[PDB]
Amino acid sequence: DIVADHVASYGVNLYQSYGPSGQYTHEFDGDEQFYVDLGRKETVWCLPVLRQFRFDPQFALTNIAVLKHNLNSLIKRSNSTAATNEVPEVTVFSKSPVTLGQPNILICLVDNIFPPVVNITWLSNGHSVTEGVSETSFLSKSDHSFFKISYLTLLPSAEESYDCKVEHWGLDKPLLKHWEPE
Amino acid sequence: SPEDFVYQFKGMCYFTNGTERVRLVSRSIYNREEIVRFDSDVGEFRAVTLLGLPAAEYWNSQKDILERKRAAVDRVCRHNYQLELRTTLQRRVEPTVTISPSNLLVCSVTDFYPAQIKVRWFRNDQEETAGVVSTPLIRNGDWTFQILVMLEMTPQRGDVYTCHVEHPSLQSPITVEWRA
């Protein structure tokens, strides 16, 4: 709601009871600069140029600890008021215009995610696809829900289609977004 | 379905005209509800709902806590910005422009950064405006964008359609032609 040329999150600090699990990331103008691998105490940069800089992963763990405490205080103080399940909003598109046999990337955009718990997987002609698959962290929105993007690498070929398969608590039955080359 | 409790803390920096105006707003969120906030414009914590009241009262009572949050806009925001100026704000990735049929002509402008971009259609050296409609700017998630700019036409003999694209990354504008 604040108007600026550039907007950073030099700390999107997340903790949740379910799991439990955490996440720590820096965002700049809507993109993920890095996340910290909490289980490994490791900084993973997401924009190559930024590998020249340092950021001590330890302190991200510390931050999550603070959050963990505070969450406990607020669960107590709010009479155990638990999160509301939203319905996620799915879209699948390609990175490049489609050329048969020429390398592409499928993007699965999953929006309005809350709570930050979701399973995002791919389906080729009914079978599932394991390799060529990666995804972003949970990215923040100003309304405090998240979005997350899943990627699949492929050579487009006629009569060869894909489904992006999303599972969320706000969803009665898992959702499938289809993609044909055409 | 399972139950879940979520706590978020966001240390957000807002920059305008380079580094002339810089604003910090630390935000605490309990399940999508911001409850306490430190905004460098204000200068102290403010509950934003009742849940955030004890927190703000306690934190504000600490002279050394406020001392350090007031310095944060310089310690965290202005500092990082210098690093951003040398890298992130220097990222220039050039658009790749492609014309193709859907009676519609789609001009695909893909894989660019930063977001500022101007795409114009021409028909035989004349600009077309009334018959053009863009998709919204699409964010790829990989530090690039893309956008699709469609044009309604009915092709006549000897017609040349031109997609014209302006981007900070280009010294000279890209033009791609298409023929009936």
Partner: peptide, 14 residues
């Protein structure tokens, strides 16, 4: 001499 990305730090409630 390697430059560092800094972060805002959260506070403990009482």
């Amino acid at each position: 001499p390697v430059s560092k990305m800094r972060m805002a730090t959260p506070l403990l409630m009482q």
